[PDB]
Amino acid sequence: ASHIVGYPRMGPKRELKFALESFWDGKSTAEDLQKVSADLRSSIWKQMSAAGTKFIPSNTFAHYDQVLDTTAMLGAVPPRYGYTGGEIGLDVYFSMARGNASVPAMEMTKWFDTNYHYIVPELGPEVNFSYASHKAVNEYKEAKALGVDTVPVLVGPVSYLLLSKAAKGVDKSFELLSLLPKILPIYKEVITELKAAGATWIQLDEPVLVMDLEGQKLQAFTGAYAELESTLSGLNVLVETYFADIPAEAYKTLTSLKGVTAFGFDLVRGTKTLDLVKAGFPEGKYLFAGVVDGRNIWANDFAASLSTLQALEGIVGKDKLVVSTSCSLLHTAVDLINETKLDDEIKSWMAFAAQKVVEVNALAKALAGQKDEALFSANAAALASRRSSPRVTNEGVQKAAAALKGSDHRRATNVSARLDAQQKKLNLPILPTTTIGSFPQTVELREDYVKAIKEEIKKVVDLQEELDIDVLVHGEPERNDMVEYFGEQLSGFAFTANGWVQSYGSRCVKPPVIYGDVSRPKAMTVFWSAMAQSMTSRPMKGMLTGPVTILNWSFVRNDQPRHETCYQIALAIKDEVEDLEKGGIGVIQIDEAALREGLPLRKSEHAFYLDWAVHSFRITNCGVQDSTQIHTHMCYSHFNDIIHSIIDMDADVITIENSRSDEKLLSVFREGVKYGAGIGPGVYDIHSPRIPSSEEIADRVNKMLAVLEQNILWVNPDCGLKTRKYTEVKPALKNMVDAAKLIRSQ
Ligand code: MET
Ligand SMILES: [Zn+2]
Ligand SMILES: [Zn+2]
CATH value at residue 243: 3.20.20.210
Helix (H/G/I), strand (E/B), else coil: 445:
coil
Structural domain including 482 reads 389-496+512-746
Length of the chain: 746
In 338-361, which positions are buried (b, 16+ CB within 10 angstroms) versus exposed (e)? bbeebeeebbbbbbbbbbbbbbbb
Query: Of 363, 339, 360, 361, whose CA–CA distance to 350 is shortest?
Result: 339
Q: Experimental method for this entry?
A: X-ray
Which residues does the annotation place in the binding site for L-methionine?
Answer: 436-438, 476, 591
Residues 382 and 506 in one domain: yes
Instruction: List the beta strands (DSSP E) in 103-235.
Output: 108-110, 117-119, 122-123, 151-155, 165-166, 201-205
Residue 543 in contact with ligand 1 by CB distance below 6 A: yes
Say which of 3, 134, 615, 687 is annotated catalytic.
687
Residues 408 and 363 in one domain: no
* Residue that terminates a domain, selected from 484, 511, 538: 511
Residues 362 and 397 in one domain: no
CA of 437 to the centre of ligand 1 (A): 5
Site to substitute for ligand 1 among 719, 721, 729, most atoms within 8 A of C-beta: 719
Residues 476 and 518 in one domain: yes
Give the amino acid at 206.
E
Residue 680 in contact with ligand 1 by CB distance below 6 A: no
**Residue 435 CB partners (closer than 8 Å, separation 6+):** 463, 469, 473, 716, 717, 720, 721, 733
Q: Pairing state of beta strands 513-514 and 507-509?
A: unpaired
Ligand located closest to 719 CA: 2
Residue 730 in contact with ligand 1 by CB distance below 6 A: no
Q: Are 324 and 288 in contact (CB under 8 A)?
A: yes
* Residue that terminates a domain, selected from 459, 481, 511: 511
Residues 171 and 138 in one domain: yes
Residue 722 in contact with ligand 1 by CB distance below 6 A: yes
Angle at 504 (CA atoms; ends 333, 557), nearest 5 degrees: 35
Residue 546 in contact with ligand 1 by CB distance below 6 A: no
Environment class of residue 323 by beta-carbon count within 10 Å: exposed (0-12), middle (13-18) or buried (19+)? buried
Residues 406 and 351 in one domain: no
* Residue that terminates a domain, selected from 482, 511, 540: 511
Task: Report which ligand 1 atom has the smallest distance to the Cα of 720.
Answer: 8
Task: Report which ligand 1 atom has the smallest distance to the Cα of 635.
Answer: 2
Label each residue of 358-374 as H, E or C: HHHHHHHHHHCCCCCHH
DSSP string, 552-616: HTSEE-SSS-HHHHHHHHHHHHHHHHHHHHHHT--EEEEE-TTTTTT--SSGGGHHHHHHHHHHH
Residue 525 in contact with ligand 1 by CB distance below 6 A: no
Residues 504 and 445 in one domain: no
Ligand located closest to 642 CA: 3
Angle at 661 (CA atoms; ends 660, 667), nearest 5 degrees: 155
State yes or no: is 331 an active-site residue.
no
Query: Of 561, 577, 192, 628, whose CA–CA distance to 411 is shortest?
Result: 628
Residues 353 and 429 in one domain: no
CA of 108 to the centre of ligand 2 (A): 18
Give the amino acid at 524.
M
In the beta sheet, which residues pair with residue 292? 325
Q: How far is CA 517 from CA 247, 387, 509, 558, in A?
A: 34, 12, 23, 12
Environment class of residue 517 by beta-carbon count within 10 Å: exposed (0-12), middle (13-18) or buried (19+)? buried
Residues 243 and 298 in one domain: yes
Environment class of residue 574 by beta-carbon count within 10 Å: exposed (0-12), middle (13-18) or buried (19+)? buried
Neighbours of 112 (CB within 10 A): 17
CA of 438 to the centre of ligand 1 (A): 6
CA of 412 to the centre of ligand 3 (A): 15
| Long-range residue pairs from 443-452, CB within 8 A, at least 24 positions apart, any chain | 444/477, 452/477, 452/478, 452/528
Q: What domain count does the chain have?
A: 2
**Residue 459 CB partners (closer than 8 Å, separation 6+):** 439, 473, 474, 475, 477
Residue 204 in contact with ligand 1 by CB distance below 6 A: no
Residues 17 and 77 in one domain: yes
- Cα–Cα distance between 721 and 442 in angstroms, integer? 12
Task: Specify the residue with its C-alpha closest to ligand 1, atom 3.
Answer: 720
